[PDB]
């Protein structure tokens, strides 16, 4: 086509989606990770995770307001990944890399899994 | 912080949101523009438009499944802007620039209004 493109549009949209998350506006699901609860937008979760994409395209699960993750999932690892989904920034540290990678594999977040594997290979 | 950032994340999220729109997945509102109807995600509309942000943060309007736009709004202009919201690409043409700018002013999409004013000033 003969379209023009606004370079910062996608980033500005995500920044606004994160502002809505911070103020709990139009969040439509709670993700339960053991004793912790995380409110989010189903669409953003689906856009970032192969697991949430499969869950919320399911004709029964699409209507659930609460999703319980596997008990092996670490709440901090999930929190770090939820922040990544809404900001593009990953708080990857020596103390959390194993939990983050395990959570990203479960959530099916291929790019996060890839950088975790690279950071781990560098420290061995 | 000591975060790393995935450059393409915001663009990939928006691409996935547009895929959901194309398959009518988790769309939660219909925007009526005269005889035409456009299905969309309230969160994406709010993230792109000052008008939709004000509408869906209203305690009564946040719960509406149908929003009727002012009858002066052109359905093609709205369609072009809805596509822009979900893709960052604006199909701006000599034949549609006036309708697009008028729709962007009504929707409160400042960057679109700015490029329309610049393209109009160049042709005078």
């Amino acid at each position: 086509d003969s379209c023009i493109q606004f370079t910062r549009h996608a980033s500005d949209v995500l920044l606004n989606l994160n502002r809505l998350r911070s103020r709990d506006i139009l969040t439509d699901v709670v993700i339960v990770v053991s004793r912790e609860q995380f409110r989010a937008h189903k669409t953003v979760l689906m856009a970032c995770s192969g697991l949430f994409y499969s869950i919320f395209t399911d004709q029964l699960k699409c209507n659930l307001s609460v999703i319980n993750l596997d008990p092996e999932i670490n709440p901090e690892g999930f929190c770090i990944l939820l922040d990544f989904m809404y900001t593009s920034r990953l708080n990857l540290r020596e103390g959390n890399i194993m939990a983050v990678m395990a959570t990203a594999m479960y959530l099916q977040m291929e790019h996060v899994v890839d950088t975790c594997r690279k950071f781990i290979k560098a420290s061995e | 912080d000591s975060c790393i950032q995935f450059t393409r994340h915001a663009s990939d999220v928006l691409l996935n949101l547009n895929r959901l729109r194309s398959r009518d997945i988790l769309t939660d509102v219909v925007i009526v523009v005269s005889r035409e109807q456009f299905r969309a995600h309230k969160t994406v509309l709010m993230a792109c438009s000052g008008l939709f942000y004000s509408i869906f943060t209203d305690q009564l309007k946040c719960n509406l499944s149908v929003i009727n736009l002012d009858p002066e709004i052109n359905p093609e202009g709205f369609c072009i802007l809805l596509d822009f919201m979900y893709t960052s690409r604006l199909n701006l043409r000599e034949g549609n620039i006036m309708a697009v700018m008028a729709t962007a002013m009504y929707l409160q999409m400042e960057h679109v209004v700015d490029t329309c004013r610049k393209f109009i000033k160049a042709s005078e």
Binding site: C3, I4, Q5, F6, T7 | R89, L90, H111, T115
Partner: peptide, 4 residues
């Protein structure tokens, strides 16, 4: 704005 750019030509994509």
């Amino acid at each position: 704005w750019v030509i994509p």
